[PDB]
Design a protein around this ligand. Sequence first.
Ligand code: SF4
Ligand code: SF4
Ligand code: SF4
Ligand code: FES
Ligand code: FES
Ligand SMILES: [Ca+2]
Lengths: 156, 147, 905
Amino acid sequence: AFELSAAEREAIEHEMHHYEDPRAASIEALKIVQKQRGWVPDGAIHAIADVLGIPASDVEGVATFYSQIFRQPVGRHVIRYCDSVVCHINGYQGIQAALEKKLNIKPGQTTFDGRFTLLPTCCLGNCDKGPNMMIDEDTHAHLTPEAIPELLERYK
Amino acid sequence: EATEAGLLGKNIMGTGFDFELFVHTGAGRYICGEETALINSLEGRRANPRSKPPFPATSGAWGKPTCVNNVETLCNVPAILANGVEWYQNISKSKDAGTKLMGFSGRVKNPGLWELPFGTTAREILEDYAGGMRDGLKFKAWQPGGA
Amino acid sequence: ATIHVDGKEYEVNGADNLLEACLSLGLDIPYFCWHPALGSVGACRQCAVKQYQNAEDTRGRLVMSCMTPASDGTFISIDDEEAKQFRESVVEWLMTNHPHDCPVCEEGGNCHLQDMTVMTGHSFRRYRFTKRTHRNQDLGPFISHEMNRCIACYRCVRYYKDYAGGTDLGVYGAHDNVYFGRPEDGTLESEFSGNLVEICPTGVFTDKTHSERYNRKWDMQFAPSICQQCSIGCNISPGERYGELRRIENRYNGTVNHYFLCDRGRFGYGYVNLKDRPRQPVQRRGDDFITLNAEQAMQGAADILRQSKKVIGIGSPRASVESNFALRELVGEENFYTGIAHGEQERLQLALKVLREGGIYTPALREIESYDAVLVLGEDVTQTGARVALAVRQAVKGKAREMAAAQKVADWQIAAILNIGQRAKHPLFVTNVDDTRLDDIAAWTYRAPVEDQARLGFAIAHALDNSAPAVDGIEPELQSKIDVIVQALAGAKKPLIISGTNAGSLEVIQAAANVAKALKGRGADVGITMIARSVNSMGLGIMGGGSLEEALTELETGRADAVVVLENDLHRHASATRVNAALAKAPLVMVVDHQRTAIMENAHLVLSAASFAESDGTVINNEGRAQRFFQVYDPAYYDSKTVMLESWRWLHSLHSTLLSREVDWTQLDHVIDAVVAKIPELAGIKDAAPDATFRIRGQKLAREPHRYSGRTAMRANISVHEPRQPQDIDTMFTFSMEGNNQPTAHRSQVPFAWAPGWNSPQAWNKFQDEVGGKLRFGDPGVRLFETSENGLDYFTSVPARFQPQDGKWRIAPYYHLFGSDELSQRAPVFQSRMPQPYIKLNPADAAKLGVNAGTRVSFSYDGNTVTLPVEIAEGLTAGQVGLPMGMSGIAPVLAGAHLEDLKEA
Ligand code: SF4
Ligand code: SF4
Ligand code: SF4
Ligand code: FES
Ligand code: FES
Ligand SMILES: [Ca+2]
């Protein structure tokens, strides 16, 4: 029983104004729903298809294609550690082991508090600043394994 | 700020040229950087690339002629039309004209990003701008472009 | 243009693809993502060849055959070392994560991946790691889903979205965990989802109706037949095993039904293997239903018909031309009545008048796709005969094709064409009593009563030509859209007008003929198509005869004491109580049919006729072309007590026993000669297929493949002695494999496509001169119709507006694809697909009645108060009520009739 709110519908229509097609605004509509509710539920696909006009199969394909459109319920904060090569040379496995020891989860899983969701990321685009990890639109650089519980405990 | 100060809108500096700019933040895929896949993602589809020789310059986004250019590519051109042309060809004695944001990365003394003219050797960048290897590393390999 | 393959010169087209140019020459290049009807993409990389620049070149470059133009002066190599080992690597990559379940798979000998794995010569495996799996989905009663078999060549999604226009299938996922399916679990609501069974080169989308009672391809006894489910007459290949029809496949014909069927014709074959069908002649005395053989039935029936004072024959629009003519010879011409209602027969006759006397060309199914502006008047095309609607979708996409061709991009790459298009659609104007499935692509949809659609057509014809009669009372808000249609059709180079007899009104046919004539007056290349009701209704109209009502009056009057009803239920074309009373008043009732109908009770003699799987016959398309269908199997091979003869055979032997007191089991060609000698306008039906004495190099053509297994143990459960093979004296076919199915054989009718190395449905490309075009050595079926030199007159009869009246309700047909056919509802797999019996009401009409949606209502027709659940139709108009025709208790002739006493139950 999904229902788009007024603010979500106004944001979707405003993004529809910026393009030649509502299909071009499908991805930003999915991002708006993800920002508002943490993730994209099953009825949100049909809601986007109804407000846009494009089929729900296209919306589901867009939602399942891009990596940062979560179709599963995630925690309140998504930890996104860099999986790439420069952070491998600087060392991301130490901070990944630190995150796994602190949270007692695996990547792709969420904590039992519904608080943190550990995920790898393609690339943060900040390779010259040591190991990198993004939590809730906040990037973090020059990471060490011993600085992980301090950086994790300042979040809600 | 640009659309407040008369730029980036309609009738720009009294010319009569209408241009308006949007920012389309992607939902995250490495394939989206390819220009045809950029066009497909901009149209809000799955970002599968398209096949050339139907090029974006003749048939791109929504079937219209578009072009896709990098941030650096679009950022060198104000210097060209503000300083000169032969000045741009005379900043480096090489057939790759212009300056490029070079720089080493990965367990060096000073990882960073420096604008250097083309023809600069990688040893110069590593041993001078990047500071070289740290105390205990032997530099067994490198890539010109990352990954 | 000329090309050089392996240092050998070839003359191919320059405007087509290189893969299809090489496949048209009989060369073998493996391919997965390319289809002749879907364009070319790069979803696989299987068609790789090595292209050079000039004649003397060694290095080359690996290019795709489906993405390289076949221009003049290309030098390609197919079977060099590098391209062969690269294609071996590509099939190795595709088969890296592929389940080890070929013997338990539905494809088996029909799989394209098997053929292209063998063709590339890849047998050894060096991939030692783990595979990839996916969960399956429930796609409905017809399509079984097995996603693990997929190779991600994107052909299903491309067909279903780009070609079929469906909104269910799609691509999900990412790099390697890619998915092809629906976002949820549910039935594929597109009417063309059955083509995914053969579109998919793997076993992902398979036939559930063939999943139940499954056999392999080589075990199927095939025949070339015509689909009997509606009037489009798509060429099919029914294949049977063990005495029951098991699977209908597509049969290629580059003029009608090239590559795709609809779901009704694909999955409505379940009525021919019902266990309640008549298998023997049964005669009743009192309450005793005894069983006779053929000779005793003919002798007894001839005796009772001789002792009768007047005989009348009631034909059917589902029987063949031969069967209806055999009835027309059994009874007199002066008393021979076509078993359809007077209004429906009148609509059929005027549609035939527009066809063969309107002076306007009627296009075939393939060339509908070349038109530039389609106007559908009154017809629910996507639901009555859906293949014309699919061709209309292709004709709509023709505008994007034209815009791409203006930019000099080749026509075989559909991705650039759809990129250039971007919802650029040819003008489609559909009119119906409610919403259609073509509304997503239509330029305009007109939801109105049927008379209002007729007045819309008359207004279009008047605004296109002032000699046409004018319409009074057109509102300016409707006149603006009238003008929109007029400027859309006037600027079109090839406008197309579609109508049919299912609209339930004469004036819709009149208005469509008027619009076509007005377009022909201004020098346009206008075509007209009419969708008839049943498979051979146009042939029955060409044959002619009285209506069913005249037969009924002849029955209760007492003038005729003997009635012979050939393959007619008689409740679809007239009211049930009147037909029952007329048949009970008749001292002799004979029913020659293969389906257990309602009138077989209290019918004094029942002849077990044969369906299309067990009979030979000729049927005329809606466009007017006369194709013919062949017998698939002998019903007397297993359980030989059943005789199950052809309908024309039964009636001809009954006529011979009536005249000379002896039976005459005649031949098909004798009946064909009798038709072309007696009826001059049916003289073209001896040109569809040659005689039974037609052989290619002295031998017949095989109904079954050369690897037909288990011949000596097929009938061993009842007799260890192998019987003689059934002798087919009627036609050009032999019931064994000792025949000919060579692709390079001088014939037009192919039972099944098989080539060495091509065991899939993609073996049809070996049977054509060029792939994706017409079939080699012509096409089955001749047109039988020539365009008249002069047209008809402007039909002055313009109907008035539909004014709603209190206490009466106008009935509007809906015509569901899975439930508005008499032979389709009897299929056990359709019964889960048809909707529940319902009735549609307007919100204003429901508010006036005080009835909420979903609750029962009661309405009285023919003195019978029946209760149906209501549902709210937004697109319906006030003063009307909507019904699904063809269903149980709801006759198709109920369209356009009145209704009384809509009271809540
Ligand atoms: S399901 Fe079949 S048609 Fe669709 S991509 Fe996979 S193999 Fe191709
Ligand atoms: S689809 Fe073809 S290759 Fe795959 S399991 Fe079935 S028969 Fe084997
Ligand atoms: S369109 Fe008509 S003739 Fe063709 S397959 Fe469907 S039901 Fe049969
Ligand atoms: S490699 Fe980690 S930020 Fe780029
Ligand atoms: S057939 Fe798939 S790449 Fe050409
Ligand atoms: Ca026969």
